[PDB]
């Protein structure tokens, strides 16, 4: 997280760390959506150009820092995830070997419903990004940054990559004052928003991709969780 700050203790209990088993290194952030399931970006597991095709025994999760390390049972990547062009449908589900014990430091986040959209996915409206990724282009504590959702045309015009409805972008425009972005190591983590309706946190996005970290005229692109809710529900049935 670039231009973020140290998070308070227990600020994001749904925070999951995706670690490489050997040699151990933080690969990606992820999120806790139930006592059993973890949500992350597809490209954190599957990106053929860089020779990347992670199995269940290549990785270990980290939850709560109180910290409960876990092995996964089954990985599910979207069948129409497009790594060739634009990272369309950059989404993947992790099933933990067994249910995790909830605590003051371990607690799942909510997936948005149609009403929660309508109400929150608007330009100017701020969301929360969190991770242990790089501060520039390593943190001691979990990092938090608040970044406003950006208009769809402004996202399209900020890049040459083809943007699909299955993605959205967020961040500040050049000379808006505040800065901030995700960076290498935050990818696959949650973009969360708080609902004024029920006082609950909802994950609207998955940190997907960007050109660099916290550059002017550029924005971080996030997977549209709600728009891929059907698929998330389908693999759990």
């Amino acid at each position: 997280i670039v231009e973020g700050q140290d998070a308070e203790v227990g600020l994001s209990p749904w925070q999951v760390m995706l670690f490489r088993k050997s040699p151990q290194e933080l690969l990606c952030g992820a999120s806790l959506i139930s006592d059993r399931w973890v949500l992350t970006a597809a490209h954190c597991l599957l990106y053929p150009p860089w020779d990347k095709n992670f199995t269940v025994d290549d990785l270990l999760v980290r939850i709560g820092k109180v910290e409960k390390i876990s092995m996964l049972d089954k990985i599910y990547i979207h069948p129409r995830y497009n790594w060739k062009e634009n990272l369309d449908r950059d989404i993947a589900l992790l099933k933990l070997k067994r249910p995790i014990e909830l605590s003051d430091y371990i607690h799942p986040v909510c997936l948005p419903d149609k009403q929660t959209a309508a109400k929150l996915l608007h330009a100017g409206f701020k969301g929360r990004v969190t991770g242990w990724g790089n501060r520039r282009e390593q943190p001691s504590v979990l990092q938090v940054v608040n970044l406003p959702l950006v208009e769809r045309p402004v996202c399209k015009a900020s890049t040459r990559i083809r943007i699909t409805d299955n993605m959205f972008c967020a961040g500040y425009k050049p000379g808006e004052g505040k800065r901030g972005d995700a960076c290498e190591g935050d990818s696959g983590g949650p973009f969360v928003m708080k609902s004024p309706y029920n006082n609950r946190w909802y994950q609207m996005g998955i940190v997907s991709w960007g050109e660099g970290c916290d550059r002017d005229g550029k924005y971080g692109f996030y997977t549209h969780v709600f728009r891929l809710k059907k698929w998330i529900q389908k693999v759990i049935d």
């Binding site: 700050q5 308070e8 203790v9 227990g10 600020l11 209990p13 959506i33 139930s34 006592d35 605590s103 003051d104 430091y105 607690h107 799942p108 986040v109 909510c110 100017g124 409206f125 701020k126 969301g127 929360r128 938090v144 608040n146 406003p148 928003m193 708080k194 609902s195 004024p196 029920n198 006082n199 609950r200 946190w201 909802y202």
Partner: peptide
Amino acid sequence: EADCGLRPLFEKKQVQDQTEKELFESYIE
């Protein structure tokens, strides 16, 4: 999840984190 969204150290304690006001504020223009 029936209890999702509510943080044990925050929403369960009616304590609000240091940058919460920042978020809700953006909602009103």
